[PDB]
Amino acid sequence: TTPHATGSTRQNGAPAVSDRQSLTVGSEGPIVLHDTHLLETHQHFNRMNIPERRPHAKGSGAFGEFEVTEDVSKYTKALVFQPGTKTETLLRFSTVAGELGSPDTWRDVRGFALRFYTEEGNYDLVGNNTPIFFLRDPMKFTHFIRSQKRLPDSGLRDATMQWDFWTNNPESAHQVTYLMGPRGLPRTWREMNGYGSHTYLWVNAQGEKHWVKYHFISQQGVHNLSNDEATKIAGENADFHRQDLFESIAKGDHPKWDLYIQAIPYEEGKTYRFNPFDLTKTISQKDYPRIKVGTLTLNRNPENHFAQIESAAFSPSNTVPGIGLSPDRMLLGRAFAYHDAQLYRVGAHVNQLPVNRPKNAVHNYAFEGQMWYDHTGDRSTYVPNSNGDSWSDETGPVDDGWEADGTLTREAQALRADDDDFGQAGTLVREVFSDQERDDFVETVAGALKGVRQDVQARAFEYWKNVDATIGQRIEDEVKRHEGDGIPGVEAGGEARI
Amino acid sequence: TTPHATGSTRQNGAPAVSDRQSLTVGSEGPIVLHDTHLLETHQHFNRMNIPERRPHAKGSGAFGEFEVTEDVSKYTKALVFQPGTKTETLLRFSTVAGELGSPDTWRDVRGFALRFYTEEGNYDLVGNNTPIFFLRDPMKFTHFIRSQKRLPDSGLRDATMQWDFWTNNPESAHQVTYLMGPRGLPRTWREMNGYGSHTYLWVNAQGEKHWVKYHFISQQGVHNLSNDEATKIAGENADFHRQDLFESIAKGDHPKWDLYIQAIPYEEGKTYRFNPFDLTKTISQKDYPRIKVGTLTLNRNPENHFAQIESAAFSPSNTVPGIGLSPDRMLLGRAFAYHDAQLYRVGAHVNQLPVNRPKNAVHNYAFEGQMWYDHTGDRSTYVPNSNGDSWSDETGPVDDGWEADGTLTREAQALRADDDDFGQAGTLVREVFSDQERDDFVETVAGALKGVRQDVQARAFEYWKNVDATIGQRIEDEVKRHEGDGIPGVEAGGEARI
Amino acid sequence: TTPHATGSTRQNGAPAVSDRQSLTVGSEGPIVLHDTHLLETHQHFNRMNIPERRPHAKGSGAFGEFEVTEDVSKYTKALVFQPGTKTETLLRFSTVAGELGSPDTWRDVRGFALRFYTEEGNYDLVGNNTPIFFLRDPMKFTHFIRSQKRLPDSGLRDATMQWDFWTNNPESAHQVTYLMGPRGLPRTWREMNGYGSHTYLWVNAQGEKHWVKYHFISQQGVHNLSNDEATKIAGENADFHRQDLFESIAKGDHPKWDLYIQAIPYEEGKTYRFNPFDLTKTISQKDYPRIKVGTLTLNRNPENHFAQIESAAFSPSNTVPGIGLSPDRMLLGRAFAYHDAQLYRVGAHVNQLPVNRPKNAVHNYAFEGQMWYDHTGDRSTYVPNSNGDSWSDETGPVDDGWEADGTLTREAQALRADDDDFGQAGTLVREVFSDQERDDFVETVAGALKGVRQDVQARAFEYWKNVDATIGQRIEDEVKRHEGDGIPGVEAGGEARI
Amino acid sequence: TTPHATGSTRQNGAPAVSDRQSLTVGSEGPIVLHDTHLLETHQHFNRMNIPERRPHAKGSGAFGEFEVTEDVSKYTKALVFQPGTKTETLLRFSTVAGELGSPDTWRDVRGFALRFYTEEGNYDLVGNNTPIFFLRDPMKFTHFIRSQKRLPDSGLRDATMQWDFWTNNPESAHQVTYLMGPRGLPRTWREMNGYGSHTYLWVNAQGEKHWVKYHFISQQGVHNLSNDEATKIAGENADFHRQDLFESIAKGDHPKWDLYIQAIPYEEGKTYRFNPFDLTKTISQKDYPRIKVGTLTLNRNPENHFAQIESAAFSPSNTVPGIGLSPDRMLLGRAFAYHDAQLYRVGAHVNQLPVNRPKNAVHNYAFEGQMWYDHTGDRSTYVPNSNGDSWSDETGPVDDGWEADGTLTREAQALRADDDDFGQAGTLVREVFSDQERDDFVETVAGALKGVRQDVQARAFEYWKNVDATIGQRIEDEVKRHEGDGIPGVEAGGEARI
Ligand code: HEM
Ligand SMILES: [O]
Ligand SMILES: [O]
Ligand SMILES: [O]
Ligand SMILES: [O]
């Protein structure tokens, strides 16, 4: 390269001389303080780690493309979803509870975080492999996630703490049922479905509004593992899912999902018999059928896992024109929480990293800070200005809002006609599951209750009978026999647990 | 508590009102920006994680006591090792390569980081479950650890990268042999030995010097698992070792280790036939026998894992009077590197956290910074001063140094009479291992080479024949038969690996 | 101290040996990497600085006591304001625009940040030396502060940018008038008044509500400097105010302020002819007279400026029972913004530093993070729990809220009968100022406009005529004569400005 | 721009809608939590500040070009200094003690930090406007800088602390003399000289070594201000120097400096009668005359002060082939300290910001970390490797080293024949200063001693008599008369100082 090159450089671009021996006073002497190559390489190594995501620490992903193949222009003006549009994507899959090195095949919810690099900005649909969640208000979220993680003294996960939380927060029943059924253990990420979970607002060119749910249906089908199979794989290959996805794309096999929405007319959101703003509820497909939008294909692996996946920063706040949030309190908390976490996790200029930059021109009133890579030159730092540096100043009602009225309060959402904590769970167990799925469910739930502190077990029996009397008695019988599956990722009991 | 109490507070000590519902405009309305309890709890949750240790992310520990029961005052003036002395301790055990959530029973070196809370400061003996290491100069360390972690694109561990490094750095043979033998898989932390590895300097009251090795011999014996057993446990219980230690102490069973040293007279350090400043070498016990010092007992579990173990910050630089470092280049790099990592990992006042504070009075010229909990009031910020605020000013040769002479260089340490890369490895395989250990070793090493890229396998066969011709041919035969154990924690081959 | 002591320690508590010479290979040789005392002291020094506050970087303060001497129990249940109560306080004074080293006597608003260490938590009244502000919605705040700071290319403050902002945001007129009058330059912090500015909610024991303004009237009177005097002092003594306060307390001279409130009945807040939720408005004392509460006395200097003042973290969100926020949008933004800034500026455990800790027992659902000094042991990390670890769960309307109704919008607050941008400014200039104050005001404002870009000057003449036709013509005449005072802290014109 | 554009974007590139009003529930209602544009802009604003440099917080600079016009190839192989070479530069000027907002015209040393963007990396000559410094060992540096900053309780600078340090560290006399003479107050940065201060190693193509000093002589001459003039300007224009430089370049007036070196033959470094490795010493130009190299011209202002100047990160460790460090202990400490400070101040990827990137290809073994903008793709993370990813492995003595021999010690450098603390100071006062400069010096030093605590004043009189008996008696006489200049930036005495 240069006349004095040595095969590598220091950080300033000068030849490094050696990547293999330190600078010493003679062969036998001490290292000197001015071994700058030693200092720079150690100091960098010491700063390679960044805080893991909380939650969803363990994951990986791939790039691809979304292709619109239907006409949903009547429901939305969003450029990404206009007829024929092809958009570059990035999808990160994850578990929830486990940390950075934790086995992929623990029983858990999976994340399904999808970015669309649109002509009007980055559009993030940060979903999960379930249409619902455990909770309906974000004040409970911190407590739920901590219940799912480790005991403060011993540092062990503990099914007693999990069940103490779940039983004391019966809104959790719908999603815990789903978690304990077949789908708590996907065989691969390619073989699970993806959902937005929340209701979102779609707005058309004329300003008319619909409430929407998103459903990504795998073209590879839904395939799951048993508890015993997942536990075996956890030991043999802690990165089974990560490996599977990367190898599949490497071999040219491009996993696909079809996107469908449900669309509720604006005024019907207030009157529907289940609350669409309640994240523990599904919306009947009889009442609001799925409408096809198009197809997602993953076709390109990362070249750098840390820069393109670990550093990726997805947010529900990354909406685009034609798509808004909704009165779902959980979604409203998420609009604050992700960007906040990322400022700490990654840094103040997280959105200037390549994977997080939009394709379109950014013109944003934010300046300075640590690691300001793409500065604004002499552009105006204030508005209005007499300098030819533009700004935004639309007044009046926004196109992606709604109405509200009341006193400031902290209380449960009002029940719709058919809202409760246990009904939809009960449908799932009685009507959706097969006989064999029911059998397996009883083995799972009894297994998850083994060794749990008796007072909490008794509350869990009442909880499962409220879902369904027959399943609940079956679970209780099996737990009183000291039977049931080992659950990958967690256990109860013993002198280091509750 | 207070007249207006509600059961919990915000950060300012005021009643929090609700830990369970957010502040909304009516039951059905949006959350308001001024839900300060929601913001404070989310913002804290978002900042709970700190970067994991690199390396040694996965670990746990316990408090105890060291009791001196012999007289080694002739070799050292250190208060902690004077006859009869009892000192409070903290011991953190760990693996090396795996991240925060990784299974405890992966094949790996274990850490054995021991702090003594002495009357003359915190004395840290930051050791491992092996007397040696893979390398003899710290410029190689960053490269070794990265070889032990994940592929940059796919994020998978890869035995090809591990073996490419090891074969290209034959100084690694002694420790890789130890790693691939019985002791790469302890059954429990209670059932492994601990070692300082490095030579350290001991200095007596009269100033006379000895070079010392530390050996902690478990009173519970050395007990190991097979590859197959460890892989099974990795799936069933990723925190097997953590759990075992906590439960054992909880039950009143106090694990013990006896400390012995070897003591080389100062002048003999320069002449000994193996280089004691070379971390890939053991010192013959025939030449320098073990001398008993005393007994370590662990007897108290943490009450808070994160504050007392995760935040603990051990450093080889934490010497005390009577104990010094040595010309071992690896130890000299460690004296810089740990404190540096901790400033980033934990913060600038890491040593003001309770677990890291000394028992004795600190009088240190450092001030301000983020999170300055224990400030110095109006004390002098400079020296000398006319203010009655003391400082240190000893001139001349230090009591814990040595001599050096030469030109500034980057080169291998000079060989002693019997120094090489393969000899001591060869002794271990031929003379220390039993027949059955040899058999198992061949299954381990062949297993670890399965699927490794052929060019690297061929180099590995030469490497193992250099250790011992018979073991090397046995390994090569078994690898060419496509046989050998699955190794917990790693594999090779396939479209997502080298 | 210890047998081997040397006069100071390293961070681990061991003797440091020397604070005055580095560890070298002979007298003439290089410093060795393992000079750990050198590394620790440099690495700490390198991390002493933390980001300065934005805004209000330049300031200082003192501790004292608040004594209630009247009965305002009818308006509030807050313990701190109940008859007879004596409460420890801390008060930090500041400028706004200038950075850490900037002269105290620049023309500017002053901060008046008062903490009360109450029995029901820390109560922060974070005010200023003015009853109003420049703006009525916090989206404008970032832009205003940047207009008040430096040009992006040259790094100079610039009166053109200041006036471009002010003229394009005519809501600023009331406060700019106050800024350009006598009170923009206090002689000392002891000789200025303090105000809450915002309307706050007070709530009595029976739940009845009043809207309140706070007024701290100096017992030392209101004394100001001329522009020329302040500029002279800026050169001679950049820390004039800091010095004055510390010396005055050191000499035993305890500066005092009397607290008065105005109290508007709840329902009258909606109907009053000026909007009390509009921070650019004062409330007539004829309509709502001042009601005495008690007396503030400062009587104790800090022993450590950095730990007790620089690290202090005040927030309007630090309310206590009996005191709430209000529909003032500016206050509502501040409830989020201060705690957020402090997490970055100081750290995640900012509220565990001594100066920021409450006197009463904290029971808060937040755990872990960097620098966790006061950990929660084995306490429950979730709610509800079966572990005896309490939490809060009040449901329904809060005691310190109010009502709202409408669609989501971005628009100006609705005008009350007498709301406008220029009226109250006009009263101040015409009716409150003396003849001599008017004269000085014209010299100040003309001075501040000297060298400002002509197009912006013309807008400023219209702006000042809208305040008052006579003052505006006088200013314009003087600016067209190229006359007026030099303003401490800023200028316009030239090749490095707009 | 886009169909739905509004004049600005959020961080994701989507239209922001309004930079001027917040999202509220009706005109009169509260702001909602999901005003993401409000949150993003406030959260960014709150993170714009980064820690100021310690020391040298206050400064500015400009870009330019260096042109070699002589032949010094016989002394160095460095590409930047080969005949005819033209190289892009960046120069930052600064004071030392004052913080970010402090007046430019305080009495102080000035920094002269020059980067050359060479074909073999960034070459940083981080100098000052003086050929010497206050100290000769870096363990004293932290203490000196803190002595120059603020009292721990009151936060005031204090000449008593300054003089207590200086008198107790008489090595300081040479540089304090220079500081208190004419050159402590440059009129402009354009009108001062620049120096490397330290001895550096130059190495030619054949490996032959010389010790070198760098001297940048202003073509605008050396022009200074009186104390009274500088104090006046401090009040009137705190950014006088910053403004001057920017306006001068804006007007097309390109300030220039001629570079000269002194060159000492390698073996003569050990024998010279003054120690060239002692930073408190100058080298006689009679013994080693100046040799011209070329000319520095500044010709381009920054477009963004924060990105190009505030974030610039200069280090003496940024040497290039042909230029090395030296046995000067102060320089050896600086090789560690700057890069360390920058990791905290700016971040782990400070050297990836544009202003800090080299022009040539970087091939450096460092990966991951926060804000990794320019990732290494799938390149090898270790060495040696079988992957075609190069590394460095030169063995033996380095081309830019030297010899050493001795025991590890902490002691003063050995004196050369003519080394002492006061001699060179004495020459400066007696022989270099004019009569009128001597007069002014007496007024400066007496002024700086006014109000200083008597015990420290008495030590200062002995100190100045040791420099020169006549100057010392003159200073003492004037101080006992209570006379002398006000010093811009500092004073003594009173109840808030020592
Ligand atoms: C929406 C408008 C405002 C916002 C977003 C805002 C934001 C901030 C921020 C972020 C800080 C730095 C906090 C820290 O780092 O500790 C601060 C400081 C300060 N603010 Fe504001 N501010 C606003 C308006 C005001 C008003 C109207 C007042 C007076 C009523 C005020 C008084 C102060 C004071 C006195 C400080 C210094 C606190 C101290 O001494 O530590 N601010 N502000
Ligand atoms: O999540
Ligand atoms: O390590
Ligand atoms: O502020
Ligand atoms: O410096």
Instruction: Nearest by CB to C18, from B8, B368, B393: name it.
Output: B393
Residues B28/B22, Cβ–Cβ less than 8 Å: no
The residue from D37, D122, D128, D210 that is catalytic is D128
Whose tokens are 């390396």? That residue is B55
d(CA D459, CA D479): 13
Tokens of B462: 């030469």
Tokens of D192: 């001062």
d(CA C409, CA A443): 52
Tokens of A83: 């007829």
User: Nearest CA to C373 among C399, C351, C341, C403?
Assistant: C351
- Paired with A127 in beta bridges are A112
Report the C-alpha dihedral over residues A29, A30, A31, A33, rounded to 10 degrees.
Answer: -130
Sign of the Cα torsion C19, C25, C31, C34 reads negative
Sign of the Cα torsion B95, B96, B99, B103 reads negative
Sign of the Cα torsion C331, C333, C336, C340 reads negative
Whose tokens are 């529930």? That residue is D25
Residues A202/A263, Cβ–Cβ less than 8 Å: yes
Q: Are A370 and D347 in contact (CB < 8 Å)?
A: yes
User: What is the distance in angstroms between the CA of the first residue and the CA of the last residue of chain C?
Assistant: 63
The backbone torsions φ and ψ at residue A172, rounded to the nearest 5 degrees and listed phi first, read -70, -10
Instruction: Nearest by CB to D15, from A11, A339, A392: name it.
Output: A392
Looking from the CA of residue C111, the nearest atom of ligand 1 is: 35
Residues A25/B406, Cβ–Cβ less than 8 Å: yes
Tokens of B133: 């290491």
- Name residues whose C-beta falls within 8 Å of residue C256's C-beta, 6 or more positions apart in sequence: C218, C219, C220, C295, C296, C297, C298
Residues A364/D8, Cβ–Cβ less than 8 Å: yes
- The answer, for A339 touching chain C at a CB cutoff of 8 Å, is no
d(CA C48, CA C57): 16
User: Nearest CA to D369 among A343, B145, A51, A349?
Assistant: A51
- Name residues whose C-beta falls within 8 Å of residue B210's C-beta, 6 or more positions apart in sequence: B75, B76, B201, B202, B263, B264, B265, B266
- Chain D residue with minimum CA distance to C496: D247
Residues D352/D373, Cβ–Cβ less than 8 Å: yes
- Name residues whose C-beta falls within 8 Å of residue D108's C-beta, 6 or more positions apart in sequence: D95, D96, D97, D98, D179, D184, D489
Looking from the CA of residue C142, the nearest atom of ligand 1 is: 5
Residues D45/A365, Cβ–Cβ less than 8 Å: no
Tokens of A220: 């590879």
User: After which residues does chain C have a break in its backbone, defined as C to next N over 2.5 Å?
Assistant: none
d(CA A242, CA D466): 74
d(CA C73, CA A432): 61
Helix (H, G, I), strand (E, B) or coil at C5: coil
Q: Which amino acid is at A389?
A: D
Instruction: Nearest by CB to B139, from A38, A242, A407: name it.
Output: A38
Q: How far, CA to CA in Å, does A384 sit from each of C141, C163, C446, C490, D137? A: 12, 11, 23, 21, 54
d(CA A82, CA A204): 11
| Cβ(B55) – ligand 3 distance below 6 Å | yes
Pairing of strands A111-118, A121-128: antiparallel
- Paired with A291 in beta bridges are A261
Pairing of strands A209-218, A323-324: unpaired
Whose tokens are 């990836």? That residue is D352
d(CA B496, CA A301): 10
Give this entry's resolution in angstroms.
2.0
- Per CB-CB distance under 8 Å, the chain A contacts of D44 are 348, 366-367, 369
| DSSP element (H, E) containing B323 | strand B323-324
User: Nearest CA to A147 among B429, C386, B385?
Assistant: C386
Neighbouring subunits of B (3+ Cβ pairs under 8 A):
A, C, D
Cis-peptide, bond into residue A103, ω within 30° of zero:
no
d(CA B5, CA C182): 46
Tokens of B449: 């080479």
Q: Are D410 and C23 in contact (CB < 8 Å)?
A: yes
Buried b (16+ CB within 10 A) or exposed e, A131-167: bbbbbbbbbbbbbbbbbbbbbbbbbbbbbbbbbbbbb
**If contacts are CB pairs under 8 Å, which of residues 458-487 in chain B contact chain D?**
none
Residues C28/D327, Cβ–Cβ less than 8 Å: yes
Whose tokens are 């990420």? That residue is A189
- The answer, for B73 touching chain C at a CB cutoff of 8 Å, is no
| DSSP element (H, E) containing A298 | strand A291-300
d(CA B86, CA B276): 30
In angstroms, what is the span from residue B144 Cα to ligand 3's centroid?
Answer: 10
User: Nearest CA to D164 among D444, D460, D422?
Assistant: D460
Nearest chain D CA: its distance from B498 CA (Å)? 9
Residues C393/B7, Cβ–Cβ less than 8 Å: yes
- The answer, for C374 touching chain A at a CB cutoff of 8 Å, is no
Residues B37/C335, Cβ–Cβ less than 8 Å: no
For chain C, give percent helix, strand, coil, nearest 5. Answer: 30, 20, 50
Whose tokens are 């640590």? That residue is A370
Residues B433/B441, Cβ–Cβ less than 8 Å: yes
Tokens of C479: 């600016």
d(CA B186, CA B110): 9
d(CA D269, CA D263): 10
d(CA D472, CA D449): 12
Question: Which domains, from first to last, does chain B contain?
Answer: 1-498 (2.40.180.10)
Helix (H, G, I), strand (E, B) or coil at A296: strand
Tokens of C166: 């002010």
Cis-peptide, bond into residue B83, ω within 30° of zero:
no
**Which residues of B belong to the annotated binding site for heme?**
338
Q: Interior CA angle at D391 toward D388 and D394, to 5°?
A: 135
- Per the rule left: phi > 0, alpha: psi between -120 and 50, beta: everything else, A44 is alpha
Instruction: Nearest by CB to B371, from C15, C371, C394: name it.
Output: C371
d(CA B308, CA B298): 15
- In the 8-state DSSP scheme, what is residue B15? B
Residues B257/B216, Cβ–Cβ less than 8 Å: yes
Q: What residue's CA is closest to ligand 1, atom 28?
A: C127
- Per the rule left: phi > 0, alpha: psi between -120 and 50, beta: everything else, C37 is alpha
In angstroms, what is the span from residue B55 Cα to ligand 3's centroid?
Answer: 5
- Per the rule left: phi > 0, alpha: psi between -120 and 50, beta: everything else, B244 is alpha
Q: How far, CA to CA in Å, does D291 sit from each of B395, D207, D216? A: 40, 20, 11
Is C128 a residue of the active site? Answer: yes
Q: What is the 3-state secondary structure (H, E, C) of chain D?
A: CCCCCCCCECCCCCECCECCCCCEECCCCCEECCCHHHHHHHHHHCCCCCCCCCCCCCEEEEEEEEEECCCCCCCCCCHHHCCCCEEEEEEEEECCCCCCCCCCCCCCCCEEEEEEEECCEEEEEEEECCCCCCCCCHHHHHHHHHHHCECCCCCCECHHHHHHHHHHCHHHHHHHHHHHCHHHCECCHHHCCEECCCCEEEECCCCCEEEEEEEEEECCCCCECCHHHHHHHHHHCCCHHHHHHHHHHHCCCCCEEEEEEEEEECCHHHHCCCCCCCCCCCCCCCCCCCEEEEEEEEEECCCCHHHHHHCCCCCCCCCCCCEECCCCHHHHHHHHHHHHHHHHHCCCCHHHCHHHCCCCCCCCCCCCCCCCCCCCCCCCCCCCCCCCCCCCECCEECCCCCEEEEEEEECCCCCCCCCCCCHHHHHHHHHHCCHHHHHHHHHHHHHHHCCCCHHHHHHHHHHHHHHCHHHHHHHHHHHHCCCCCCCCCCCCCCCCCC
For chain B, give percent helix, strand, coil, nearest 5. Answer: 30, 20, 50
d(CA D394, CA D377): 26
The backbone torsions φ and ψ at residue C297, rounded to the nearest 5 degrees and listed phi first, read -125, 130
Q: What is the 3-state secondary structure (H, E, C) of B226-281?
A: CHHHHHHHHHHCCCHHHHHHHHHHHCCCCCEEEEEEEEEECCHHHHCCCCCCCCCC
Nearest chain C CA: its distance from D492 CA (Å)? 11
Helix (H, G, I), strand (E, B) or coil at C301: coil
Q: At what angle do helices B36-45 and A329-345 cross, to 10 degrees?
A: 40
User: Nearest CA to A64 among A334, A294, A223?
Assistant: A294
Tokens of D120: 């073999």
The strand ranges marked E within B75-110 are 86-94
- The answer, for C40 touching chain B at a CB cutoff of 8 Å, is yes
Please indicate the experimental technique that yielded this structure.
X-ray
Cis-peptide, bond into residue D51, ω within 30° of zero:
no
d(CA D43, CA B39): 13
CA-derived radius of gyration, chain B? 26
User: Nearest CA to C195 among C297, C110, C319, C90?
Assistant: C110
Residues A355/A307, Cβ–Cβ less than 8 Å: yes
Nearest chain B CA: its distance from D272 CA (Å)? 21
d(CA C433, CA B313): 63
Residues B223/B188, Cβ–Cβ less than 8 Å: yes
Residues C297/C255, Cβ–Cβ less than 8 Å: yes
Helix (H, G, I), strand (E, B) or coil at A206: coil
- Per the rule left: phi > 0, alpha: psi between -120 and 50, beta: everything else, B322 is left
Nearest chain D CA: its distance from B248 CA (Å)? 38
Buried b (16+ CB within 10 A) or exposed e, B176-197: bbbbbbbbbbbbbbbbbbbbbb
| Cβ(C138) – ligand 1 distance below 6 Å | yes
Report the C-alpha dihedral over residues A461, A465, A471, A474, rounded to 10 degrees.
Answer: 40
Residues C54/D46, Cβ–Cβ less than 8 Å: yes
Residues A150/A57, Cβ–Cβ less than 8 Å: no
- In the 8-state DSSP scheme, what is residue C429? I
DSSP secondary structure, A28-97, as one string: TSPBBTT-HHHHHHHHHHTT---PPPSS--SEEEEEEEEEE-S--TTT---GGGSTT-EEEEEEEEE-SS
The strand ranges marked E within B100-141 are 111-118, 121-128
d(CA B493, CA B457): 12
Q: What residue's CA is closest to ligand 1, atom 6?
A: C334
Whose tokens are 């002979």? That residue is C26
Q: Are D29 and C404 in contact (CB < 8 Å)?
A: yes
Whose tokens are 């070249």? That residue is A303
A313 alpha carbon, distance to own chain's centre: 11
Residue A338 marked in a binding site: yes
A361 alpha carbon, distance to own chain's centre: 27
d(CA A202, CA A210): 5
- The answer, for B367 touching chain D at a CB cutoff of 8 Å, is yes
Q: What residue's CA is closest to ligand 2, atom 1?
A: A55
User: What is the distance in angstroms between the CA of the first residue and the CA of the last residue of chain A?
Assistant: 63
d(CA B422, CA B428): 10
Burial class of residue D435 in the structure, from the number of CB atoms within 10 Å of its CB (0-12 exposed, 13-18 middle, 19+ buried): exposed
Neighbouring subunits of C (3+ Cβ pairs under 8 A):
A, B, D
User: Nearest CA to D318 among D292, D338, D348, D347?
Assistant: D338
| Residues across chain B | 498
d(CA A258, CA C225): 72
User: Nearest CA to D329 among D424, D411, D416, D274?
Assistant: D411
d(CA A10, CA C131): 57
